[PDB]
Design a protein around this ligand. Structure first.
Ligand SMILES: *[C@@H]1O[C@H](CO)[C@@H](O[C@@H]2O[C@H](CO)[C@@H](O[C@@H]3O[C@H](CO)[C@@H](O)[C@H](O[C@H]4O[C@H](CO)[C@@H](O)[C@H](O)[C@@H]4O)[C@@H]3O)[C@H](O)[C@H]2NC(C)=O)[C@H](O)[C@H]1NC(C)=O
Ligand SMILES: *[C@@H]1O[C@H](CO)[C@@H](O[C@@H]2O[C@H](CO)[C@@H](O[C@@H]3O[C@H](CO)[C@@H](O)[C@H](O)[C@@H]3O)[C@H](O)[C@H]2NC(C)=O)[C@H](O)[C@H]1NC(C)=O
Lengths: 462, 124, 124, 124, 53
């Protein structure tokens, strides 16, 4: 009959809530220098401990498109890039005119670059000297309103002064571990069939999320994690066709890209105590950069995406098309190949249709054959807003290769047609949250509310 | 059971191992002011519970009977249905509405009870 | 009465509602380092009183009788004149001079009393 | 004896004046973020001991018997040899290896003892 | 101008060697080797404690 209220503390109770999260990184990165890189220079060393602990039974709900953790990651990456560009020279004298030789070819089919000449400051403020430096064509703009062929200028000096990235600090995607502070926790949707919303069946708790790679790409997702089961389609909505649709592959597709040209760095002094780096000469013959992808593997992968994508477009075809054109920074598969910012035309990849039946890898003329893409290269890189924008990527000598794995797609859909099944998909992208959201679909943060109340047969002794 | 393994299990099971959760309010070393902000926030949040549980006379750690009776309208349940099958994690959701009056009672009752420790000691 | 409504009223009136003032050591969210400085200062200042009151054995919250007798030279007053008409706010001003000896006595008395809880427990 | 004057003297002598060392976790005003870091570190480090000693039921300040016995293999000594000649400063070095099991025992013993305060109060 | 751009020191700020006292924070302490024959290593014989060097 008589029951008195008793207060419990240390209760297992929580709410999903907002908070800032630590960095964390593995110990091996800490052998390196200062400012090289943030994973060491701006982030706490952490063994991924305490280990994962599965919860025996939990009633839980999730939503990955409204998650604030990805917005926090966006803020961190942008504000950290702004910090990383601070200690380097901001160019500025290179707004001088460039007088560039008017080369003409019989459609050589290999981009020649433009060899330019201009004035630079010697070791005294007052005396000047002529210099030269080869520049990639897309970064060089003609100056005259008339039809002049002689004079040119850099693409910047109309928006802002670009800052050279110091070659001492690299761009490799060192993994980042996100750790919640004390009083909070991260609940991990351990379910294998989770599709981005609703309730999860199986949940675990982990102090520190494992292995997020800050790798940026527009259309294909490189070096990401792999799903445990079918090639799940994910989207915030499918009534709103403008909502970007993210595809997460089960097995990888190898991609290898390279720049055969043997460029050579040049050192151009710009005022006191700083240098401007550019391409001085090209050793050997001139050739074309690219990306190679296994052929039958991509065919099988794009049919496998079809058999899963078929269900939400039930009676209709899964037919693919190129991107819808536009800005080359949008349409092209843009990524960094270890120092050089490639921009690939993907039109060879997305061209075909599917009719609902799975097909084998045979017959094969020769399994070593590969589909090839053609890619350009820049040095003046405009990628993010509010970060001081344009950054001049320095040259890198020798030749390069960046063999990697394709593990996802970012796609977009056109409108309906004629009550007809040929509504087609297009690659697209550019909102970076979509890149990091593909890796954070598992996690969600909570705040522990460890104080609670309940009755029991116990008066106070007083 | 660690940090949250007791969650979902019955309130009887979760009544033990409270010390494991109380011990888990430390973390981190700092880059930047964000992580320092996290540290100060955590310390203030912990002290808020510490000095609020203390006002109810519950300095005896973390299970503490009080003199306030349970108004059955809050739950309308027998002690078996509250405790034997239900879990804390959903019980907090169910009780979430009524907290203000409960906390006020738990404050005022000990506020008026403490003077009697003087009164029943001043006879000598 | 809230934060300071009891001020000016008699010490008898202000003896109650102490919990309203103890609960009022939280505030703020931060722009710049000034507000964070304020937060850390507040936390340290609170813990100063908390860990200092505890050393006198007064873990029973916030009214706590002690064995030390009152030296009448400090006030030279009867319990009626101290309590029935005066207010705490001026009483602190009146007593402001003598505090060091009082605090030393309260420290040493509990420092020597604590061992006797071992001594009258070791007989078994 | 102040901050560390009792160091080196016998453990019996150092058993007194614990209040002098407990009162010495307050210092500093700040230039730059380094000193602010020092303040926050000090506060967290103090609260770690405060909230860890409390879980063992030792809310009675800073000397606190408990129910767990001495496993003689840890020291293999009589109470005279531990106490009458040896000093705390080297005793910590000697005992430094065995601390984890001791802390686990001190945690679990009070974790299981606390419910009996309900059990021997629910009869009424 | 071969290395970097030098910065003039403002004459309003001086260069005199004003003494500095190093103070340890709360929870820490400094032990001072008070022995007069200490030679830069090994055990000290006589020790003191000081809050601020
Ligand atoms: C890219 O274009 C730049 C200029 O736009 C060009 O740089 C110039 O190259 C020439 C040739 O190497 C340099 O001039 C040489 O200087 C040496 C110094 O020892 C002289 O011996 C050379 O004299 C011979 O060659 C001349 C023709 O170049 C003859 O006229 C002369 O009679 C001699 O036979 C020659 O003068 C010049 O200094 C640079 N200019 C700058 C600014 O650096 C570069 O070669 C082009 N690169 C490519 C890959 O197209
Ligand atoms: C610069 O160009 C040279 C030649 O054009 C590149 O050499 C090639 O590098 C690749 C790297 O993967 C070599 O791959 C081989 O892989 C097999 C496994 O399939 C492995 O067993 C071999 O030991 C080898 O690593 C390839 O053999 C090699 N040569 C050729 C003709 O392709 C070089 O990689 C380029 N440098 C950079 C920095 O990109």
């Amino acid at each position: 009959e008589n029951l008195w209220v008793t207060v419990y503390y240390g209760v297992p109770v929580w709410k999903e809530a907002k908070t800032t999260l630590f960095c964390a990184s593995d110990a091996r990165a800490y052998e390196k220098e200062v400012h090289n890189v943030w994973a060491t220079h701006a982030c706490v060393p952490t063994d991924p401990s305490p280990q994962e602990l599965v919860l025996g039974n939990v009633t839980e709900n999730f939503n990955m498109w409204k998650n604030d953790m990805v917005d926090q990651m966006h803020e961190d990456i942008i504000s950290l890039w702004d910090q990383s560009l601070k200690p380097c020279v901001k160019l500025t004298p290179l707004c001088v005119t460039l007088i560039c030789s008017n080369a003409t070819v019989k459609n050589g089919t290999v981009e020649e670059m433009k060899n330019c000449s201009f004035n630079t400051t010697t070791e005294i403020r007052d005396k000047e000297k002529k210099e030269y430096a080869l520049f990639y064509k897309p970064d060089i703009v003609p100056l005259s309103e008339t039809n002049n062929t002689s004079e040119y200028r850099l693409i910047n000096c109309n928006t802002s002064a670009c800052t050279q990235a110091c070659p001492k600090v690299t761009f490799e995607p060192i993994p980042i571990h996100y750790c919640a502070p004390a009083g909070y926790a991260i609940l991990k949707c351990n379910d294998e069939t989770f599709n981005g919303t609703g309730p999860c069946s199986n949940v675990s708790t982990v102090q520190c999320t494992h292995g997020i790679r800050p790798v940026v790409s527009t259309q294909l997702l490189l070096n990401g994690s792999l799903a445990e089961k079918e090639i799940v389609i994910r989207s915030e909505n499918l009534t709103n066709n403008a909502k970007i649709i993210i595809v997460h592959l089960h097995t990888p597709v190898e991609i290898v890209c390279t720049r055969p040209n043997n460029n050579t760095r040049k050192s151009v002094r710009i005022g006191p105590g700083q240098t401007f780096y550019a391409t001085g000469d090209i050793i050997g013959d001139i050739k074309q950069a690219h990306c190679n992808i296994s052929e039958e593997k991509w065919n099988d992968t794009l049919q496998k995406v079809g058999i899963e994508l078929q269900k939400h477009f039930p009676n209709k075809t899964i037919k693919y098309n190129q991107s819808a054109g536009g800005d080359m920074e949008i349409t092209t598969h843009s990524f960094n190949c270890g120092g050089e910012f490639f921009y690939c035309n993907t039109s060879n990849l997305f061209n075909g249709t599917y009719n609902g039946t799975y097909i084998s890898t045979n017959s094969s003329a020769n399994s070593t054959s590969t589909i090839t893409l053609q890619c350009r290269i820049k040095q003046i890189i405009n990628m993010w807003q509010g970060v001081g924008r344009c950054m001049y990527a320095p040259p890198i000598a020798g030749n390069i290769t960046c063999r990697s794995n394709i593990t996802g797609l970012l796609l977009t859909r056109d409108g309906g047609t004629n009550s007809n099944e040929t509504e087609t998909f297009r690659p697209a992208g550019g909102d970076m949250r979509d890149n990091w959201r593909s890796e954070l679909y598992k996690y969600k943060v909570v705040k522990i509310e460890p104080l609670g109340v309940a009755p029991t047969r116990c008066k106070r002794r007083v | 059971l660690g940090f949250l393994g007791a969650a979902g299990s019955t309130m009887g099971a979760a009544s033990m191992t409270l010390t494991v959760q109380a011990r888990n309010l430390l973390s981190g070393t700092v880059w930047g002011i964000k992580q320092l902000q996290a540290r100060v926030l955590a310390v203030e949040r912990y002290l808020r519970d510490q000095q609020l549980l203390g006002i109810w006379g519950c300095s005896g750690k973390l299970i503490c009977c009080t003199n306030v009776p349970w108004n059955s309208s809050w739950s309308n349940r027998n002690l078996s249905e509250i405790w034997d099958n239900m879990t804390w994690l959903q019980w907090d959701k169910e009780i979430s509405n009524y907290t203000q009056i409960i906390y006020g009672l738990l404050e005022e009752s000990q506020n008026q009870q403490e003077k009697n420790e003087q009164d029943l000691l001043a006879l000598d």
